[PDB]
Amino acid sequence: SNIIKQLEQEQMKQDVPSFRPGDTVEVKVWVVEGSKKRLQAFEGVVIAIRNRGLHSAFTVRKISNGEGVERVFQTHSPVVDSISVKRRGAVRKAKLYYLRERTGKAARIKERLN
Amino acid sequence: MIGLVGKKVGMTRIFTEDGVSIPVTVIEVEANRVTQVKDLANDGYRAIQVTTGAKKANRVTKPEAGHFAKAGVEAGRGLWEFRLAEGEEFTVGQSISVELFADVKKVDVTGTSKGKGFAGTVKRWNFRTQDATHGNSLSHRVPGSIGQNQTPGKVFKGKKMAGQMGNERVTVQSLDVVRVDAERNLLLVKGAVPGATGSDLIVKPAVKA
Amino acid sequence: CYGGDISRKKKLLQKQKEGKKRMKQI
Amino acid sequence: AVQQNKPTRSKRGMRRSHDALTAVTSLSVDKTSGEKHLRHHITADGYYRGRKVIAK
Amino acid sequence: MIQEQTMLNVADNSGARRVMCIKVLGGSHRRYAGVGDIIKITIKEAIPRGKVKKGDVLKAVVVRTKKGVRRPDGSVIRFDGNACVLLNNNSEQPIGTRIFGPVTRELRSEKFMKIISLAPEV
Amino acid sequence: MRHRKSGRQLNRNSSHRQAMFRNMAGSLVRHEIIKTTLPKAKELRRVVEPLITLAKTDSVANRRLAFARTRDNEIVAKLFNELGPRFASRAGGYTRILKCGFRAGDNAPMAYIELVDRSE
RNA sequence: AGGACCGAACCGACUAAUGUUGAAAAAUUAGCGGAUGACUUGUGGCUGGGGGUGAAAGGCCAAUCAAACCGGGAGAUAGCU
RNA sequence: CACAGGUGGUCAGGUAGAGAAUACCAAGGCGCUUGAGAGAACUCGGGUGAAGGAACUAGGCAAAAUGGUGCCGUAACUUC
RNA sequence: AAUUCCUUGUCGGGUAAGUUCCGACCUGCACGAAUGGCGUAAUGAUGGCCAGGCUGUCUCCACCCGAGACUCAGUGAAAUU
RNA sequence: GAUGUCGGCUCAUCACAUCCUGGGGCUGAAGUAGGUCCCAAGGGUAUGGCUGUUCGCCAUUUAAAGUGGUACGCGAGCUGGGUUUAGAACGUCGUGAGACAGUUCGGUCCCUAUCUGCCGUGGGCGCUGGAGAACUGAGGGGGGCUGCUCCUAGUACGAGAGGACCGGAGUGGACGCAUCACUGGUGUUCGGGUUGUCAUGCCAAUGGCACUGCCCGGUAGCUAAAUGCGGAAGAGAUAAGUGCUGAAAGCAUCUAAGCACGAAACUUGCCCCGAGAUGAGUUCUCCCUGACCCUUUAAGGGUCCUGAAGGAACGUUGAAGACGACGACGUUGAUAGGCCGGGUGUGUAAGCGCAGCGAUGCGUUGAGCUAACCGGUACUAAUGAACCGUGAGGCUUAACCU
């Protein structure tokens, strides 16, 4: 509906890379300790997918320090800052939830390399 | 003082670029021209009678089109009165608009709640559920005992029980006006106002400080 | 149960006391 | 639960005030073939608004 | 949403290992707790050398939570495993001297300076 | 509490519904006219017309779906060969409803439903 | 080899849900126990009411058992209603 | 009662399976003698459930789970 | 203790906390040797207590699919009064 | 002449002899903390372990874990654990049948609501010509809790330790209201995966059946654990309490004349219902200006012409709905379905080609399919008519006007 639209289209980043699930993306979110506003990196396999427009967001699982983690990101939020697809992946399944259950040697995904 | 009469269109987030996701409810606010200006000399009290967005002429009844035939042009979907205090406003469709709210900090919006149509206990007044098992007999969700044994001898009036729910009125109070906007007539309130999308809204500056 | 009979109760209190006479001195 | 006393004929009648049937109001007709019919319905001939649907 | 019962892992040394919540401090009736809440604790397994032992009672600042935490952009951390940092019952101030695993930025505060000063991440 | 849903239940489990509209729509596309209780007819538009729009253009895959549903070679052949082209360019609205009204056997409302231009 | 073992028909009756003017004057649905034996069952046979029969609960004997059913004494008697 | 009950014997197909279990189908026979609309509580029968996992309660009642074969391996105790 | 009234007997184990449980003392109100005593591997739709697993039992309910309830046509009852 | 008894569950309500919050006196009250008493019923009042338990002990809380009545509140609302049925055993008593406020194990909880009450929702009629809107608000209900630091200020008090009064800001818990944007749940009406089997002549490719066959993801909607908001401030008259002036009583004396302060209670302030408020209120607009006859001659009865606004009906339907109701649209039309484009979801269809002995891979290919959403489109269906609805609308009294 045109009644919205005008709000949403002016509020979308257009530069966001066309990332695909299972891409080993690295995201550099902003963080403010207080005065400082330094970046923080966050490597990981993608597991979810966006697709709502301005509301679109994507999830990233990682495994770190012996403790697995996950973190959604609002695609058009300013805090996300830089977003690199890094290493690619291929999975042929829109939501890689079954990875939450797996680990180690079985936890790998292989390059599309086409 | 007077608020205006709008039309909920249904929710969106907006980012403040310093870095926070503020939810907001979008509201079209077509200008609300007055139709009559009731006062003590008019037999009554200070008030204004405003109409709003366009309605087909063919539905309009003769008494109505005649009521708009005086003063203000072109009938809207309906009418609403609003109270006054030292507010001088002519009967001419002065077309009060969105920009009036720019001074306001917090507001109201009085909606029309979605129709549940049945309630019953639990969904309505949030009565607690009885045991789902350990032998419960045909009472997994019944209202339960509703009075004392005999010396009242009656169920008290005002008892909480099953019945129709929602679809009434209920206001909101507070609500930051995250963004007044003209040339478009949009009102970005800080989220969550009663009523299904496209329902009429009756917005006023908050009586609370 | 209470019943209201007199001798039906003092037996019980007699037991309750008779135990305390032992349990105290022990 | 069952009654402790016998309700009166006046009471049963009061309970039956709303049982009354409703009138069909204005019965409708085709503008071509004769035929009275329920409005928004096929006439008994099979005519409806002039045109003859249902050959049989 | 650590709530009553609910086994909790330890994220520090001191060797409590498996742990169990038994109360949710935060006034009357408060139900769920997490992120950076304080809760009561009874130790289960505990290390044989033992900075502490089985049947001990303690307080703990929950750190990681499976249900995570949000913060304004709408991002939601979701650690896959529960954890808490042990505290002395009166002095507060965790009795450990190490912190395993990631911790939330949300945990950050005045008196938790002690905890986040340690900890490998965030 | 239903709001904004679309899908009549018609007092049957989902499998029975799907089988029912299957046999019924086959009967419709076959006989052109059919007589049925009104809610079934209004719920029949939604099933039938999309098949014809599917049938508006021949291709092997289109026959594979048109046969994949209804599961009847004579009618899927009857589309594409015949009822396909015959709707050369109508936007839609292939079917009209005509309420004859009120079956005597249980006083259920009735209506014929038919392809838009059976003509004869 | 076996009053062996897991498990259908076959016999049984532990739990719960219904059902309670039920579909049913004892059943249904999901489970459960026995299942080569102190089994299970068809067909006829005999034991008779202060007697039968009883791996004993005072149970069972034609939907009823601390004394069956039908008829007779019989208009038993009733300081009671 | 045109009743979800009771009634002994013989016959015993195709594929899966240890089988007369079971699933699907043959020969064969059926749709159970009120229907039709709506899609609210409540009841009944089930499907799924974020975090927690007996905190429920008289009690883990019910529900959920384990569930097949081949091998490797198996305790306290004993009347072997 | 299927025996113990006074009794939530005292001490130990188990639990964050244990009127039940397991262990021992003897002050056995009123156990005891064929109306058997004390042991017992196996066996139990048996009594009580614990633990892993698992789950809507629960904090706290939520949504969906079927049969009722609801509206329409035809048949059309009942306890009671 | 069967009013079926502790306890637990859901659900409550009222009293004040008040545990908390609020206000005062007094103190063996420096401060903080206390103590006892006076006033006060607005709101609040814990999870567990053990036992059939209310109780009690205990673990850990909390601003606090109020006492009582309500058939020892509450079984035509639920539970049957205790307790008072028949089986059984122990201890004990009796020679015996048996008995035990002594114990142990196993034991059928019925009802379709006529009336009273209660939560909801309609039909009639009245409100004095009729109708369409909007209000006015008598009266009524809803809501009324509180922690925690920081500031004031390490300040008054104290030697210290310790540590405020009044006054602000911020931020939590419990609770209610509201809502799908976010995060998630369900989504048997969307797509793929897969076993067993049956069918479509067969290969292929698709369908049925097995709980949706077993699953994996998921739109709309609905929803909480999601995110928005909420108690108040102010004003009136007040209790306990303190007072100013001051007589009875040259003094005194808060009081008898008088005069002023004084708390979550009271009445207002926020929300919602609300003119059946039969006292039926107010305001705006709209429609009706034709005849004739009989009398018992009065709010009379007919008959003829007349049918306005509006209403209802019917049809397509709704983010409204059990049924009616309320909302939208009905050809000058986007109400629904259809069709068109997107979005979204699923994850590389089919076909053909290529590799391999074969499964399978690869290319065509981010391909298809896509429910409930949006944006458009008259393609189908919302009919040209009737039916209900009247024809200027009482008497008297006054004031203006003839």
- Tally the domains of chain D: 1
Give Cβ neighbours of residue B36 (< 8 Å, ≥ 6 apart): B48, B49, B70, B71, B91
Contact B25, B188 (CB under 8 A): yes
CB spacing of E74 vs B19 below 8 angstroms: no
- Tally the domains of chain F: 1
CA distance A71 to A74: 10
* H helix or E strand, kind and range, residue F13: none
C-alpha D19 chain-centroid distance: 14
For D35, the domain range is: 1-55
Torsion of CA F14, F18, F23, F24, to 10 degrees: 90
Nucleotides of J under 7 A from a protein CB: 9-13, 45-47, 59-65, 70-80, 101-102, 109-123, 130-137, 141-142, 147, 172-184, 188-189, 200-201, 205-210, 212-213, 216-218, 220-223, 225-233, 269-273, 282-287, 309-322, 328-330, 332, 334, 336-340, 343-351, 362-363, 366, 368-375, 377, 379-387
- Residue given tokens 């006006």 in the structure block: B177
Contact F76, F63 (CB under 8 A): yes
Contact A59, A70 (CB under 8 A): yes
- Residue B77 DSSP one-character state: S
Determine the distance between F12 (CA) and G8 (C1') in angstroms. Answer: 35
The 3-state DSSP class for residue B31 equals: coil
- Residue given tokens 């967001």 in the structure block: A57
CA distance A49 to A39: 24
Determine the distance between F5 (CA) and J178 (C1') in angstroms. Answer: 22
Is F19 part of a structural domain of the chain? yes
Contact E12, E86 (CB under 8 A): yes
Q: Is B28 at the interface with chain A, CB within 8 A?
A: yes
For chains A and C, having 3+ Cβ pairs within 8 Å is answered: no
Q: Which residues pair with A58 in a beta bridge?
A: A73
CA distance E117 to E94: 12
The 3-state DSSP class for residue E84 equals: strand
Expressed in Å, this structure's resolution amounts to 3.7
- By CB atoms closer than 10 A (0-12, 13-18, 19+), residue D4 is exposed
Give Cβ neighbours of residue C25 (< 8 Å, ≥ 6 apart): none
Q: Is B20 at the interface with chain E, CB within 8 A?
A: yes
Contact A36, A28 (CB under 8 A): no
Q: Is B17 at the interface with chain A, CB within 8 A?
A: yes
CB spacing of D42 vs F120 below 8 angstroms: no
Nearest to A65 among E78, E80, E120 (CB): E120
* H helix or E strand, kind and range, residue B86: none
- By CB atoms closer than 10 A (0-12, 13-18, 19+), residue F61 is exposed
The 3-state DSSP class for residue F31 equals: helix
Is F7 part of a structural domain of the chain? no
* Assigned token pair, A57: 């967001």
Within 10 Å of residue A114's Cβ, how many Cβ atoms? Answer: 5
Contact E85, E99 (CB under 8 A): yes
CA distance E4 to E8: 11
The 3-state DSSP class for residue F55 equals: helix
Within 10 Å of residue B140's Cβ, how many Cβ atoms? Answer: 11
* Assigned token pair, F7: 């899908």
Contact A20, A84 (CB under 8 A): no
Q: Smallest CA–C1' separation from C16: which nucleotide?
A: I6
* H helix or E strand, kind and range, residue E32: none
Is F61 part of a structural domain of the chain? yes
Compute CA distances F74 → F69, F71, F79, whole Å.
13, 9, 9
C-alpha B35 chain-centroid distance: 21
Domains and CATH numbers, chain E: 1-122 (2.40.150.20)
Q: Which residue of A has its CA nearest to B7?
A: A3
What HEC string does chain A produce? CCCCCHHHHCCCCCCCCCCCCCCEEEEEEECCCCCCCCEEEEECEECCCCCCCCCCEEEEECCECCECCEEEEECCCHHHCEEEEEECCCCCCCCCHHHHCCCHHHHCCCCCCC
CA distance D21 to E77: 66
Q: Smallest CA–C1' separation from F13: which nucleotide?
A: I66
- Residue given tokens 């049937």 in the structure block: D21
Please spell the DSSP secondary structure of B149-183, one letter per residue: SSSS-SPPTT---SB--S-S-------BEEEEETT
- A2 φ/ψ sector (left φ>0, alpha ψ -120 to 50, else beta): alpha
Q: Is A16 at the interface with chain B, CB within 8 A?
A: no
Scan residues 69-88 of chain E and list those with Cβ within 7 Å of strand I.
none
* H helix or E strand, kind and range, residue E57: strand E57-62
Residue type, F43: E
- Distance (Å) from the C-alpha of residue B187 to the closest C-alpha of chain A? 12
* Assigned token pair, B28: 């079209």
Polymer length of chain D: 56
Q: Are strands E83-87 and E57-62 parallel, antiparallel or unpaired?
A: antiparallel
CA distance A8 to F41: 42
Return the sign of the alpha-carbon dihedral for residues B153, B154, B159, B161: positive
* Assigned token pair, A8: 């949403």
Contact B36, B20 (CB under 8 A): no
Residue type, E105: R
E66 touches strand J (CB under 7 A): no
* H helix or E strand, kind and range, residue B118: none
* Assigned token pair, F90: 């109508």
D25 touches strand I (CB under 7 A): no
What is the phi/psi pair of residue B182, to 5°?
Answer: -90, -160
Compute CA distances A89 → A62, A109, A114, whole Å.
14, 6, 11
Give Cβ neighbours of residue E30 (< 8 Å, ≥ 6 apart): E24
Question: Which residues of chain F are at the D interface, by a Cβ-Cβ cutoff of 8 Å?
Answer: 33, 98-101, 112, 114, 120
Residue type, F27: S
Return the sign of the alpha-carbon dihedral for residues B163, B166, B171, B173: positive
* Assigned token pair, E14: 């001191």
A76 neighbourhood in chain B, CB within 8 Å: 15
Compute CA distances F71 → A21, A112, B27, B153, F76, whole Å.
38, 39, 51, 68, 8
Compute CA distances F63 → B19, F45, F79, whole Å.
54, 20, 9
Q: Which chains touch E (3 or more CB pairs under 8 A)?
A: A, B
Contact E8, E21 (CB under 8 A): yes
- Tally the domains of chain B: 1
CA distance E59 to A88: 45
Contact E96, E86 (CB under 8 A): yes
Compute CA distances E51 → D56, E9, E97, whole Å.
98, 16, 11
- Distance (Å) from the C-alpha of residue A71 to the closest C-alpha of chain B? 17
Instruction: Please count the residue pairs, one from chain B and one from chain E, whose beta carbons lie less than 8 angstroms apart.
Output: 8
Q: Which of F119, F113, F53, F43 is nearest to F83 (CA)?
A: F53
Q: Which residues pair with D36 in a beta bridge?
A: D29
Within 10 Å of residue C4's Cβ, how many Cβ atoms? Answer: 7
For F81, the domain range is: 13-116
Determine the distance between A94 (CA) and H48 (C1') in angstroms. Answer: 21
Nucleotides of H under 7 A from a protein CB: 34-44, 50-59, 61-62
Q: Which chains touch C (3 or more CB pairs under 8 A)?
A: none
Alpha-carbon radius of gyration of chain E: 14
For B83, the domain range is: 1-209
CA distance A112 to A20: 11
CA distance A1 to B9: 10
- Residue given tokens 């770190």 in the structure block: A64
Which long-range contacts (C-beta less than 8 Å, at least 24 apart) are formed by B59-67?
B67/B35
Q: Is E73 at the interface with chain B, CB within 8 A?
A: yes
The 3-state DSSP class for residue E44 equals: coil
A4 neighbourhood in chain B, CB within 8 Å: 9, 12, 26
- By CB atoms closer than 10 A (0-12, 13-18, 19+), residue E88 is exposed
Q: What does the domain layout of chain A look like in residue ranges? A: 1-113
Q: Which of E72, E71, E69, E70 is nearest to E34 (CA)?
A: E69
Say which CATH number the domain at F58 has: 3.90.1030.10
Compute CA distances A93 → A19, A26, A49, A109, whole Å.
14, 21, 11, 12
